[model samples]
Target: GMACQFWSCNSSCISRGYRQGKCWGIQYKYCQCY
Candidate 1:
């Protein structure tokens, strides 16, 4: 499987909360050829 991952810190992922200044989770997706 061909996949890739991307991540954004709280600065972009969080709107407002405790983790507001924390690092968010990573985002992953697969590439498909059709």
Candidate 2:
């Protein structure tokens, strides 16, 4: 199954961490998984 994309997308973890914006990294991963 795909990892929880909403963790970073639906949440604000990215903005609070080593990311610059909405979880584009996770979004990309989600894209690959699909």
Candidate 3:
């Protein structure tokens, strides 16, 4: 479903514990979170 893209990055990044960001899953996506 391609759902594992940037949406999850923010959900994960914005959470402020793990701060995992993207287009960055160590590679690619279409969103930015910091």
Candidate 4:
């Protein structure tokens, strides 16, 4: 499956599991949980 693009202390990923890393784009950055 694909990783997430955002996360926080109050963030909820549901069935996506925990945070793994960040997704750096040309316009933005985010967190990836696994």
C-alpha TM-scores of all predictions: 0.16, 0.19, 0.35, 0.20
Local accuracy of candidate 3 as per-residue lDDT tens digits, 1-34: 4644766776766776656566644444455666
- Whole-structure CA lDDT of model 3: 0.60
| Residue 7's lDDT in candidate 2 | 51
lDDT (CA) for every model shown?
A: 0.31, 0.40, 0.60, 0.41
RMSD to native, candidate 4: 7.7
Q: Report the lDDT tens digits of candidate 1 across residue range 1-34.
A: 2233222333433443334333223334322221
Question: lDDT tens string, model 4, 1-34?
Answer: 2333443311544345654434444333344445
Better of 1 and 3 by TM-score: 3
Clashing pairs in 2: none
Off by over 4 Å in 3: 1-4, 17-21, 24-32
**Consecutive 10-residue window with the lowest summed lDDT within model 3:** 22-31
Error of 4 at 29 (Å): 8.3
Off by over 4 Å in 4: 1-15, 26-34
Order candidates by lDDT, high to low: 3, 4, 2, 1
